[PDB]
Design a protein around this ligand. Structure first.
Ligand SMILES: Nc1ncnc2c1ncn2[C@@H]1O[C@H](COP(=O)(O)OP(=O)(O)OP(=O)(O)O)[C@@H](O)[C@H]1O
Lengths: 602, 331, 194
DNA sequence: ATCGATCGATCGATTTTTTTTTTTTT
DNA sequence: ATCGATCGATCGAT
């Protein structure tokens, strides 16, 4: 309706001057943010606009299609006032907006829900490659002359061009490559989430539409949310059905979100002010697993690989390994299995396949095509799902040796490869790798070296820079320090807010790049000499050349945590100490003697 | 409607704490305390909080074992046809998946079809099985897996998935000797690992032997089961009226923040200070998770008593429950 | 779990097989109801619903007391069996005298049982001696371990009590589950560490 | 003479399609 | 290749 044009003025009001939490319009910043970002897709809080007028959202609840198609229009110029010449750039944007329950799953939807925007949940599945879209139609026609001007079509119809542009026909309309705008297009399959799947019922398949920025941003097998519009669209022929006559349902979400956040200036800026404190390192342990208590030491190693680090590349050769391979020697009854789960919702990118039997998925790439049928599908190992994201696994003892080859495999080349079958490539996957496995038999396998402790080979274990060993035999006050802690934990029914701390690392992994100064680092080459031969004196060795390489990947972490951009001595201070007793605990009870020599390295 | 009046009529009765038990499973003869836990598996703890974060359990577990022809089968088949969505298996060949994903092939036109399967659908419900030793180790892994991560991730050469199973679980694996072997430490007595052992609190062993008084009682009580009559003999409660009462009990989220919870701590201290020596007794350790179930123990108790925040006397009950639960590991 | 087991056997009666062969000697050439029982097979189902009443219960008890002197699973059948006999003769109430041969039909399988895990110690004495042997070897040998071959030499050879290698290995496994022993690989056998 | 329906010549669209390399299970 | 519909005209009716 035309009066809705009047709505634009009012709906554009909330678009700009609205503020909350000490003013500071996010949309004003939204404009300036993208902005140099030039995301060219705005997002709006539904909760806030609904807080203002849900009646407008009710139209979004009614017919959000043109509602935003009206709503987007000034959003361009509403930014263009902020960006006077930007119109030359992209000349288009549309708001993804925000939470819009719904919160409907898959199989629950109805024609009542049709044509009105519906946010929806589902598991990402196989999809077509990104294709060009017709965007704006135009006709060089036949007898009638060029260019005739562009027609707006279509998603997706484009008709009918009966009689026009001169005359009419047979001089009829036909599209020409010139002066015709196009855009990216991707169809996608997304099935409902199995974790949310009702028992014994097969999950339903759903088509997933992609246009503009939304396209290709999704990745297959991802847990995801989507805000779409359900319709009988489109066609309907489908001359097959017929009985009973229907248009097969399809939906394009305005928005998509991975399982289930980003930093901003005003966020990061004060967020930078948090970084300046040195003691921040502690609250990192304090914010590590506050509900868990547990070992401050075990969490330290958690803090390490969790924080990530520079690869770093060597011209023009190997980048070595910037990801930590984390290992945990388990204890029965201990919180160990629980912690990595903390990291799970903690990690921006995370994947947990546990041991085997087997949790998702095959732990390796089994995919062979198969042209035919229909195209089949290609996948890698479990780590393929998350790259640069840390690995999550536990109790390799329950793993098959075949999949266990990929274990030592993944940590090694940091690229995935397999023999099946005709298709030939090189897959590169870089993932920090966590491991926690329960010791064979009892609480503590043997005082004898963990090589005696574990059936697992040291060489495959060798890829593990960090070994998390736990204990202990019962102690009096020990549980008072915990059980009292634990009981008070359950009373529910210091650390940084996880949003900040989780943003902290992702902000870090996205930005800060520490570098050592070779001068003061000479000591470690000297300090390590104490850390090999004397450490060699007991056990076999088990000192490794790779092991030294770790200390740097160790150092890189704390520095970014310090946000120093370069390696500092204090960064090493932990780096050594982290490694010292870590290597120490691997020793037998004779290590108590080994403890006294390591004192020089403190 | 008027049914809730029955509740208020039920909630007034003190002896119901005893009566709920006597009303439990009349088809079975005796075993008493074993019965209560069945109800206790039927109402778990908060299975929730406390943030940020991790969601603390929650649930509960038992595997009762002893001489075959103990009619331990009486319990499973009882509640399996009793409690809603109660799932049961032979506990030998599922085969594996069963609970695992096949993963299903072909389609056709595709492959890698992901079945749950098996124990998912019992989700937020009591699951019962038999003889873990029969399914060997292969699934003991994931069986133990579901016991940690609760909900489990799964696939084979397919798409990744994490399936939700939060399911109360019980089962029965016959003794390797089917007998005792009283001197047997329950730890090595069970033919299985401690973690799956320590995970379920608790198995609750029982044994059978000839008692001429009971042999007549068995001769008496059991044949009346065989009897077409008298079928007139009854427990205090209609199974249905208690089940609806169950849901009324289900509604509660009793939370003991009461300083008596502090008293529970040394009760755990006093629980395991003695178990340091020797280790050849019921240890275990005892596990610290035992205190966790000690939480879920009271979590089960208060629901039956309907009162929130429980009491230490109740705390003693669950504590004592573990004690006999643990002492079955003694000798 | 099976309701009953009939165990077929041949005594080579002379004196049996001949006349059996004489029964086999039939065809050759050239009171037995045929279908009339099959209707009674159907007739005896829905039209007969027997109840043992009091009398049968009393007898059923003492037998089973001597049965275990068995299982309630056998007691489960004793009722299920006799009442089948009760389904016979159009009875709506069981005869007190059926259950005799009802237990006896169980006795029939029982007479088959006159002819291992169920005999006292077996693996137990073995594991006591396996333990004591490796303990003595532990305190004597400079290791807490000894070879499985050396075990087959130090166990199986000495006596009939001593079991065959695989069965020692079974005892060792069951001891490994007890944490009385350590495998120390396939090459050797170790005693549990303190 | 206006209107129609009627037949025919006008126009243009529709006609094949599943087997050998595989792969997670004990 | 044949069948299918469009569409054109024409000869009768009012
Ligand atoms: N140090 C600790 N602090 C707080 N809670 C703990 C601690 N240790 C153990 N727990 C509790 O015990 C439970 C341990 O379960 P978890 O998820 O770690 O599986 P797991 O015990 O590692 O399995 P397994 O030991 O068989 O490998 C958790 O629920 C946790 O609350």
């Amino acid at each position: 309706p035309n009066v809705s044009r009047t709505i634009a003025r009012e709906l554009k009001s909330f678009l700009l001057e609205y503020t909350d939490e000490t003013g500071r319009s996010v949309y004003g910043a939204r404009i300036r943010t993208l902005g140099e970002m030039n995301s060219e897709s705005l997002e709006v809080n539904y909760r806030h606009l609904a807080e203002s007028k849900a009646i407008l959202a009710l139209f979004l609840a009614k017919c959000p299609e043109e509602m935003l198609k009206i709503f987007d229009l000034v959003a361009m110029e509403a930014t263009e006032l902020h960006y006077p010449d930007y119109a030359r750039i992209h000349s288009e944007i549309h708001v993804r907006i925000s939470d819009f329950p719904t919160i409907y799953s898959l199989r629950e939807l109805r024609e009542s829900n049709l044509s009105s925007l519906v946010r929806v949940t589902g598991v990402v599945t196989r999809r077509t490659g990104v294709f060009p879209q017709l965007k704006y139609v135009k006709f060089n026609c036949l007898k009638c002359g060029s260019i005739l001007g562009p027609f707006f079509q279509d998603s997706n119809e484009e008709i009918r061009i009966s009689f026009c542009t001169n005359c009419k026909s047979k001089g009829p309309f036909r599209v020409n490559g010139e002066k015709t705008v196009y855009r990216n297009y991707q169809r996608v399959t997304l099935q409902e989430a199995p974790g949310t799947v009702p028992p014994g019922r097969l999950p339903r398949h759903r088509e997933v539409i992609l246009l503009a920025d939304l396209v290709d941003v999704s990745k297959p097998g991802e847990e995801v949310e989507v805000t779409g519009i359900y319709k009988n669209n489109y066609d309907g022929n489908l001359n097959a059905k017929n009985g009973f006559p229907v248009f097969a349902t399809i939906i394009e979400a305005n928005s998509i979100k991975r399982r289930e956040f980003s930093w901003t200036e005003e966020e990061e800026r004060e967020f930078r002010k948090i970084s300046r404190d040195r003691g921040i390192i502690d609250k990192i342990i304090s914010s590590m697993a506050p509900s868990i208590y547990g070992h401050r030491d075990i969490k330290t190693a958690v803090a390490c690989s969790l924080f990530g680090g520079v690869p770093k590349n060597v011209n023009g050769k190997h980048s070595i390994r910037g990801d930590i391979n984390v290992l945990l020697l388990g204890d029965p009854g201990t919180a160990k299995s629980q912690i990595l789960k903390y990291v799970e919702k903690t990690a921006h990118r995370a994947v947990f396949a546990t041991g085997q039997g087997a949790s998702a998925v095959g732990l390796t790439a089994s995919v062979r095509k198969d042209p035919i049928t229909k195209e089949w599908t290609l996948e890698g190992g479990a780590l393929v799902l998350a790259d640069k994201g840390v690995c999550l696994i536990d109790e390799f003892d329950k793993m098959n040796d075949q999949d266990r080859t990929s274990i030592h495999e993944a940590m090694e080349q940091q690229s995935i490869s397999i023999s099946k079958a005709g298709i030939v490539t090189t897959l590169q996957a870089r993932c920090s790798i966590i491991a926690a496995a329960n010791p064979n038999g009892g609480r503590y396998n043997s005082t004898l070296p963990l090589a005696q402790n574990v059936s697992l080979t040291e060489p495959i274990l060798s890829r593990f820079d960090i070994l998390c060993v736990v204990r202990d035999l019962v102690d009096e006050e020990a549980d008072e320090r915990l059980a009292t802690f634990v009981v008070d934990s359950h009373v529910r029914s210091s650390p940084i807010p996880q949003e900040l701390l989780m943003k902290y690392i992702h902000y870090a992994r996205t930005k800060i790049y520490p570098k050592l100064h070779q001068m003061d680092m000479d000591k470690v080459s000297r300090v390590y000499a104490d850390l090999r031969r004397e450490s060699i004196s007991t056990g076999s060795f088990p000192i490794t050349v790779r092991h030294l390489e770790s200390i740097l990947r160790i150092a890189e972490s704390f520095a970014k945590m310090r946000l120093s951009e370069f390696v500092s001595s204090y960064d090493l201070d932990r780096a050594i100490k982290v490694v010292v007793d870590s290597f120490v605990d691997a020793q037998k009870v004779s290590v108590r003697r080994q403890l006294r020599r390591s004192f020089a390295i403190y | 409607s008027d049914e809730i009046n029955e509740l208020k009529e039920m909630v007034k009765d003190e002896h119901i704490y005893d009566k709920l038990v006597r009303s439990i499973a009349p088809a079975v003869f005796g075993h008493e305390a074993v019965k209560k836990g069945i109800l206790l598996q039927m109402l778990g703890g908060v299975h929730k909080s406390t943030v940020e974060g991790i969601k603390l359990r929650g649930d509960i577990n038992i595997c009762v074992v002893g001489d075959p022809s103990t009619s331990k089968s009486q319990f499973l088949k009882y509640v399996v046809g009793f409690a809603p969505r109660s799932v049961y298996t032979s506990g030998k060949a599922s085969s594996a998946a069963g609970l695992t994903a096949a993963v299903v092939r072909d389609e056709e036109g595709g492959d890698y079809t992901i079945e749950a399967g098996a124990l998912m659908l019992a989700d937020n419900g009591i699951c019962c099985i038999d003889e873990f030793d029969k399914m060997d180790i292969s699934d003991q892994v994931a069986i133990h897996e579901a016991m940690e991560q609760q909900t489990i991730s799964i696939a084979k050469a397919g798409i990744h998935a994490t399936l939700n199973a939060r399911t109360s679980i019980l089962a029965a694996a016959n003794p390797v000797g089917g007998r005792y072997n009283r001197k047997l430490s329950l730890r090595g007595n069970l033919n299985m690992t401690a973690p799956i052992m320590s995970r379920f609190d608790l198995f609750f062993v029982i044994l059978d032997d000839c008692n001429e008084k009971i042999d007549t009682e068995l001769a008496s009580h059991i044949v009346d089961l065989h009897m077409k009559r008298d079928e007139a003999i009854e427990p205090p409660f209609s199974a249905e009226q208690l089940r609806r009462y169950i849901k009324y009990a289900r509604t509660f989220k009793p939370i003991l923040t009461k300083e008596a919870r502090s008293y529970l701590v040394e009760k755990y201290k006093e629980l395991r200070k003695d178990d340091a020596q020797g280790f050849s007794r019921s240890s275990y350790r005892i596990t610290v998770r035992q205190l966790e179930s000690m939480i879920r123990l009271s979590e089960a108790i208060a629901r039956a008593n309907c009162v929130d925040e429980i009491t230490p006397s109740f705390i003693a009950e669950a504590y004592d429950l573990l004690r006999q639960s643990i002492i079955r590991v003694d000798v | 779990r099976f309701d009953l087991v009939y165990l077929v056997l041949d005594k080579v009666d002379e004196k049996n097989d001949r006349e059996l062969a004489k029964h086999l000697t039939n065809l050759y050439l050239e009171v037995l109801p045929v279908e009339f029982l099959t209707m009674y097979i159907s007739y005896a189902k829905e039209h007969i619903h027997p109840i043992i009443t009091e009398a049968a219960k009393t007898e059923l008890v003492r037998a089973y007391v001597g049965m275990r002197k068995a299982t309630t699973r056998q007691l489960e059948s004793m009722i299920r069996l006799a009442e089948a006999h009760a389904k016979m003769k159009l009875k709506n109430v069981v005869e007190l005298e059926d259950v005799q041969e009802a237990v006896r039909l169980i006795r029939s399988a029982i007479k088959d049982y006159a002819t291992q895990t169920g005999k006292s110690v077996i693996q137990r004495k073995l594991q006591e001696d396996l333990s004591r042997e490796i303990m003595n070897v532990l305190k004597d040998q400079a290791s807490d371990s000894m070879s499985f071959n050396e075990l087959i030499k130090q166990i199986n050879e000495h006596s009939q009590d001593r079991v065959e290698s695989s069965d020692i290995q079974e005892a060792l496994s069951r001891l490994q589950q007890e944490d009385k022993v350590i495998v120390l690989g396939e090459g050797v056998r170790r005693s549990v560490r303190l």
